[PDB]
Amino acid sequence: SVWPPPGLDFSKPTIARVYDALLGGKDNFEADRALADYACKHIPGLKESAIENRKVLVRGVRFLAGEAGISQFLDLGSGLPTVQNTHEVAQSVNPDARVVYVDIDPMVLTHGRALLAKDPNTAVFTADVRDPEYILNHPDVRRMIDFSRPAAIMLVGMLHYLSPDVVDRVVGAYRDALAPGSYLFMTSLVDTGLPAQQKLARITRENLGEGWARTPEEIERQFGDFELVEPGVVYTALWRPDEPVDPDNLSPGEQLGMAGIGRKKA
Numbered sequence: 001s002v003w004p005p006p007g008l009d010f011s012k013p014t015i016a017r018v019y020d021a022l023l024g025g026k027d028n029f030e031a032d033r034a035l036a037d038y039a040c041k042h043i044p045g046l047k048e049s050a051i052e053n054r055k056v057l058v059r060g061v062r063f064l065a066g067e068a069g070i071s072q073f074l075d076l077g078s079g080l081p082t083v084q085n086t087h088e089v090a091q092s093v094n095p096d097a098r099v100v101y102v103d104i105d106p107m108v109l110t111h112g113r114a115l116l117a118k119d120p121n122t123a124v125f126t127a128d129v130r131d132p133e134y135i136l137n138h139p140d141v142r143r144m145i146d147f148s149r150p151a152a153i154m155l156v157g158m159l160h161y162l163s164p165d166v167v168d169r170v171v172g173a174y175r176d177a178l179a180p181g182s183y184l185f186m187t188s189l190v191d192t193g194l195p196a197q198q199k200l201a202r203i204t205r206e207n208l209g210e211g212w213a214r215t216p217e218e219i220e221r222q223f224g225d226f227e228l229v230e231p232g233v234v235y236t237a238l239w240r241p242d243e244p245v246d247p248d249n250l251s252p253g254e255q256l257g258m259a260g261i262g263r264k265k266a
């Protein structure tokens with residue numbers, strides 16, 4: 001078998017591969033599809049929640065690279081590739097945009113290295129986001145991002161994998177690295193008291209190692225002093241929609257996660 005690489009199959013699911021399976025990608029093994037299937041059986045709207053997270057990723061990156069004028073992105077916990085990735089969105093509005101992707105799953109590097117050796121403004125590497133010091137000093141980071149100028153750091157679909165004991169220091173390190181005029185874009189599994197939210201967090205914790213549903217206020221808090229851009233921290237489908245959407249008529253899948261983008265002030 002030539003793909004996914006058999007040497008990466010330990011009959012254990014990974015976060016990247018399961019999310020890929022939820023989106024209908026082929027970068028996954030049976031253990032990943034089995035867990036996605038199981039999760040969908042217990043968690044209504046799970047796949048739709050992933051779709052909405054990808055759609056807000058696109059809308060947010062388009063806001064950042066176009067309107068906000070940002071040319072430098074650090075995409076933490078990037079995941080495996082989809083039909084619309086960060087650098088593709090960024091370059092569609094801003095041909096000079098530069099994106100550095102970071103993921104812990106080696107399959108992300110293996111797939112991507114292929115796709116991105118032809119792009120001098122896009123780089124990918126394997127690392128653990130819980131070690132900001134290592135990521136912020138990596139040669140791909142240092143050669144691609146000048147942190148003395150505005151940048152965007154993204155923890156899209158990533159915040160709920162940071163435990164209570166590490167989250168404050170980890171997200172704080174990345175906020176602290178940024179120049180005034182920079183942005184932090186995150187999305188997260190949310191606890192608004194709907195039953196599936198904490199059940200989904202449990203399944204993720206038990207099967208994938210980490211999974212923390214945060215209240216809207218706990219999500220907002222991880223933006224620190226940054227100034228939230230309108231509409232603030234809201235269900236992912238409600239974040240600057242480009243397609244009609246009614247906040248009182250959301251499905252269960254549209255209430256699993258929230259999105260927010262905040263700006264660092266001078």
Ligand SMILES: C[S@+](CC[C@H](N)C(=O)[O-])C[C@H]1O[C@@H](n2cnc3c(N)ncnc32)[C@H](O)[C@@H]1O
Nearest residue numbers: 015016019077078079103104128129156157161
């Ligand atoms: C794939 S899902 C979200 C993907 C993408 N950011 C999105 O929102 O569409 C979460 C991703 O975060 C990565 N991840 C979780 N914890 C990580 C960590 N501590 N260091 C690096 N990557 C991590 C997973 O491997 C996975 O690829």
